[model samples]
Target: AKALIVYGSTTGNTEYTAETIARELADAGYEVDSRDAASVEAGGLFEGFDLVLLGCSTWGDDCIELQDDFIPLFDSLEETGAQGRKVACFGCGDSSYEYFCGAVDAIEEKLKNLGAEIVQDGLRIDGDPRAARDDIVGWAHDVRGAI
Candidate 1:
């Protein structure tokens, strides 16, 4: 299957998560395209892909906020033809924060609203994703099985 991974990261945490997942998926014989959210546009973004993985770090305390680079894509997700498409969300955030990994929750909800088929629960890393490499690889395995 072909897969696309788009991520927004400020401290390189989420980007590391994306890269790890990309490597795992690629090893599983899937054609993968991993891109920084800052360099991507939302319109028809998921076209022809068997799976799309979105990774963005959470910000703010009282309210949930997506990483800066992902905001525009989050806003225009419907235009990306997400309806009936297979997708999954992941992110890194401080567990001490009020809304831990809230960006992942928000994105999953939006994708659900757009009729996207979510294959698994979101993967939310509590801190630096590089330290959670095992978790990332495991999640990729799960997603690969689901697909």
Candidate 2:
């Protein structure tokens, strides 16, 4: 199965998380592509994939840098109406803040509003990703099974 890992990163934390997931999926015999969310053409271009995974790191309370550019483009997704696409999400954040993983929450809400079917709960990593990677790998395996 083919899986797409779309990630938004500032300090490379979220990008690293996305890459780890991609490599694990590929190692498990799944075709995977990992891309920075900003570089991809948004909207229904995501429809062709069997699974669409989103990644981001939390910035200031409930805010994301790349999300500013990404949010507006999601409006175009409704035009193509590519609903029912399975998706998973992950985020890196510092728990010192009140709203941890707020970026991932925002992306999940946006994706759901844009018609992506939620398949697995999003994984949130705070500082270290030792256990986080394993959780993501399990989620990816589930996504591959569904595909």
Candidate 3:
């Protein structure tokens, strides 16, 4: 299957997480395309991909907020061809925050609302994603299983 990983990050945690997931998916004999949200346009972003992975860090304390670069894409997600698509979300954030990894939840909710099939529960990292390498790999394994 073909997989697409798109990530928005401020401190590189989500980027690293995306890279790790992309590597895992590629090693599993999948065609993977990984892109930074900053360089990506939202329209038809998920087209031609069998699986879509979204990664973005949470940034708000009182409410769920997506990373800055991801906001436009999120707003235009309807144009991403998400309807009937298989998707999963992941992110890195501080558990001490009011809404830990809220971006992941927000994205998943939006994807579901747009009729995308959620392939797995979101992977939310409590702190540094590098410290949660095993969790990332495990999540990828689960995603592969679903595919």
Candidate 4:
């Protein structure tokens, strides 16, 4: 199986998480293609991938906001051919925030509305993603099995 990971990061936490998920999927016998969301286009983005992962960091105080680079792609997500595609979401944020890891929830909600099949719940990491490495790997494994 092939997997694709597209991540948007401000302080690199989400990027690290995305890479970790990519590596885990690869080690589990999947051909994974991971890239920065800043460089990804919306059209047919998930066309050939059997599984797709989207990661982005959250921002804003009272209101939820997605990572800067992810905004445009997210707005144009309907063009990504995500319908019926297997997808999962993940992100990093501080638990102190009103909407901790809100970006992950937002993405997962959007994917669901876009008709994407979510194989697992979104991985929401509080604080440094590196510290949550084990959790990420475990989630990745569960996602792999769900596929």
Q: Give TM per candidate.
A: 0.98, 0.81, 0.98, 0.98
Superposed by TM-score, candidate 2 places the C-alpha of residue 128 at a distance from the truth, in angstroms, of 3.1
For candidate 1, the lDDT comes to: 0.94
Candidate 1 lDDT by residue in tens digits, 1-147: 999999999889999999999999999999999999999988999999999999999998798999999999999898998999999999999899999999999999999999999998999999788889999999999999887
10-36: candidate 3 lDDT, tens digit per residue: 899999999999999999999999999
The number of residue pairs in model 1 that clash at the backbone is 0
- Model 3 spans > 4 angstroms off: none
Alpha-carbon lDDT, every model: 0.94, 0.73, 0.94, 0.94
Q: Which stretches of candidate 4 lie over 4 Å from their true place?
A: none
Better of 1 and 2 by lDDT: 1
**What is the Å distance of residue 12 in model 4 from its true position?**
0.5
**What TM-score, to 2 decimals, does candidate 3 have?**
0.98
lDDT string, candidate 2, 19-115, tens digits = 8889888898778888886777764666678787878777776444334434444445464334788887887887888888887787778778868
Give the TM-score (vs. native) of candidate 4: 0.98
Please list the residue runs of candidate 1 whose C-alpha ends up more than 4 Å from where it truly belongs after superposition. Answer: none
Candidate 3: minimum summed lDDT over ten consecutive residues — where? 61-70
